[PDB]
Structure 1
Amino acid sequence: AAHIGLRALADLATPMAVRVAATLRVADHIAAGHRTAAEIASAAGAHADSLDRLLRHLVAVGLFTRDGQGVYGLTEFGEQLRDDHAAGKRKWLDMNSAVGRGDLGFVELAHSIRTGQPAYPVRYGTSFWEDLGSDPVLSASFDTLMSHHLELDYTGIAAKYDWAALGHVVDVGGGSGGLLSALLTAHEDLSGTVLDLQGPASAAHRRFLDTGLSGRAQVVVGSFFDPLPAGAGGYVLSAVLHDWDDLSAVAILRRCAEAAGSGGVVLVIEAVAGDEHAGTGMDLRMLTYFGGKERSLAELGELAAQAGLAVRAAHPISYVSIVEMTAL
């Protein structure tokens, strides 16, 4: 990019206008029949006049079309704004979801860049997890979004690795049990345990009960900073490490190392720096949310090193990687 005006490249009005449309579900109200500002507004519960000005800006962006007596219609693009779209982006943009709300934490980016600390707290006076831990509905939405990322990224991951060979896997921080689920459903004879906080663990359990996996699927509420269910064949750290700073990440890694002993493997499944799903933007998001960071195969090794582990493999999956570490 960068071919657009510097002021345009720095524009906030548009990205904010798009996010607001997503939150009012304007695209849904248009397809559902309400095609004029007065209607969409009363339908979404917005200020009729102000809402019109928003739309006008959005027809200009190329998300909506307006004509004659001000009848709005989604464009080939605006289509992606409705909840029932394949992509399922509206939920990430909606300002009520964990991510849609948390991304507004970017307005405090300056803080992070000046102190190397998360900016989310500067905006919401608390850590992201603390926030999700005290808002069940918010935490619920995060579980939903992460569940969605499993699809977008881990397509066919069950096959790309020799899971069965593990016998029993602990999904450290595998909230909502989507990955473990997709893993067991694809490899019978294999059992697992999802370890996460009350919120996700409660959803993982609910999941296994319905998919009829409670026989091989176990849940255990707890922090991955404390001893983990020891002796498993494998310990997966899926989309966890990048959520933490270096110190924390090695702590998390050691716990896995310990529980794994000289008999198991520690599989970190993340978007290592270089993957088609790992950008500088994700890294910035990681920094602004918790002061985490995307890391390279190299940087992960430096960490594994400080935990008594050693990278022995790296198989690239669909958009991310499966870094396999064992004790050294």
Structure 2
Amino acid sequence: MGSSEDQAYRLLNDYANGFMVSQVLFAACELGVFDLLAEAPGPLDVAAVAAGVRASAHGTELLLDICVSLKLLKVETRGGKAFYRNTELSSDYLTTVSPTSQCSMLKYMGRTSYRCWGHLADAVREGRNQYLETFGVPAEELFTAIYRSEGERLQFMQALQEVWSVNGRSVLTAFDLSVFPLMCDLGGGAGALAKECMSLYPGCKITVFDIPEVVWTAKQHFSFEEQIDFQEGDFFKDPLPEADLYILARVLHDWADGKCSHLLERIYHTCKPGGGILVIESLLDEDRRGPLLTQLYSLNMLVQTEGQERTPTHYHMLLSSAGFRDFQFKKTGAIYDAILARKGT
């Protein structure tokens, strides 16, 4: 990718070099270079950043300089010295104090997904995930592999909640959910989406439903409101909480059609006339050929779960088969879209 070379060659190098750019961003997060800059009295030199993050003078310099070129950081010259500062981008998304922080998700991508992706050819060859070949941990029970340790589980929970600080409003306000006074977030993790949901619908109440170890770490690590309640269990076998609306955010994409049909049938059979199901997923274009981000997300499900990303028609087949009617969707213009279907008589 030399300035004077063929557009195709330049594009090819961009693609090839993508993993280096991803890891510069992940490493900057992992070392906390953005937080140190936000906690600083002004801009910092290379020696200061290096000292404050316990890293090399040579290593730090290179990292800061790439961040500047990537427009993650800004640099100013004072005397014979470069001083670094945050951008609008890093302040809004790469600072732990920021409410729209994307830090934890980026750290998970670099420590977890990145490794899995190193075995992509094999996942493509086998049509299955690579936890065993990557971490030496079996995935016969998906979430035993995903929650490898207490540490891994917390990181996963901190990671996933972050998108809702930017995407939450569009998915919950796509349809008017004020018709469902009592709600249940099936596989709600730490309860970030339910916390968002409760501020938008003040006349509602919600129960966050997840596996016992998740419910425990949620109560133990994430602070709590008056409208949010918890229930531990397995949604494939246990009695589900009574609700007018069951929310399924990034649950269906973890599983194959059959497993999906099973959970959907259980929810249907628990619903009452007029009850609803709100599926929050990144919708794939009808020709499965876009959006590129969603396509990459489907391949990550090949590598990280037992599922895939799906087209609106595919969700309609699944939901119709379970017994739901009045299927509707809304493309938000964001990663995450919203589907609402209902139970009749």
Normalising by the smaller structure, the TM-score range is 0.7 to 0.9
Give yes or no for contact 1:231–1:264 (8 Å, CA) kept in 2.
no
* Secondary structure of the structure 2 residue equivalent to 1:161: coil
Structural RMSD (CA): 3.6
Q: Percent identity?
A: 22
* Secondary structure of the structure 1 residue equivalent to 2:193: helix
Segments of 5+ residues of structure 1 without an aligned counterpart are none
Task: Summarize the alignment of residues 70-219 of structure 1 with structure 2, pairs less than 5 Å apart.
Answer: 71-74=82-85, 76=87, 79-80=90-91, 81-84=94-97, 87-94=100-107, 98-104=108-114, 105-126=116-137, 127=139, 129-131=143-145, 133-155=147-169, 157-202=171-216, 210-213=224-227, 217-219=228-230
Task: Give distance in 1, aligned partners of 2:25 and 2:192.
Answer: 30
Task: Determine the structure 2 residue equivalent to 1:267.
Answer: 278
1:100 to 1:254, Cα distance in 2 relative to 1, 3 A: farther
1:53 to 1:177, Cα distance in 2 relative to 1, 3 A: closer
- Aligned pairs, how many? 322
1:245 to 1:59, Cα distance in 2 relative to 1, 3 A: same
Give yes or no for contact 1:178–1:204 (8 Å, CA) kept in 2.
no
Give yes or no for contact 1:35–1:72 (8 Å, CA) kept in 2.
yes
CA deviations on 1:229-248 (whole Å, 9 max, x unpaired) are 26532222122111223232
Match of 1:22 among 29, 34, 51: 29
Q: Residue 132 of structure 1: CA displacement?
A: 5.2
* TM-score of the aligned structures, taking structure 2 as reference length: 0.76
Q: Which amino acid aligns with 2:328?
A: A
Task: Determine the structure 2 residue equivalent to 1:42.
Answer: 51
Give yes or no for contact 1:35–1:73 (8 Å, CA) kept in 2.
yes
1:87 to 1:209, Cα distance in 2 relative to 1, 3 A: closer
Q: Which amino acid aligns with 1:140?
A: L
Task: Give distance in 1, aligned partners of 2:119 and 2:280.
Answer: 29
1:205 to 1:161, Cα distance in 2 relative to 1, 3 A: farther
Task: Give distance in 2, aligned partners of 1:186 and 1:29.
Answer: 34
Give yes or no for contact 1:174–1:180 (8 Å, CA) kept in 2.
yes
Segments of 5+ residues of structure 2 without an aligned counterpart are 1-6
1:34 to 1:235, Cα distance in 2 relative to 1, 3 A: same
1:197 to 1:70, Cα distance in 2 relative to 1, 3 A: farther
1:72 to 1:63, Cα distance in 2 relative to 1, 3 A: farther
Q: Residue 76 of structure 1: CA displacement?
A: 3.9
Give yes or no for contact 2:208–2:229 (8 Å, CA) kept in 1.
yes
Give yes or no for contact 1:172–1:236 (8 Å, CA) kept in 2.
yes
Q: Which amino acid aligns with 2:52?
A: A
Q: Which amino acid aligns with 1:154?
A: G
| Mapped pair 1:324 → 2:341 | yes
Q: Which amino acid aligns with 1:252?
A: L
Task: Give distance in 2, aligned partners of 1:254 and 1:279.
Answer: 26
1:184 to 1:26, Cα distance in 2 relative to 1, 3 A: closer
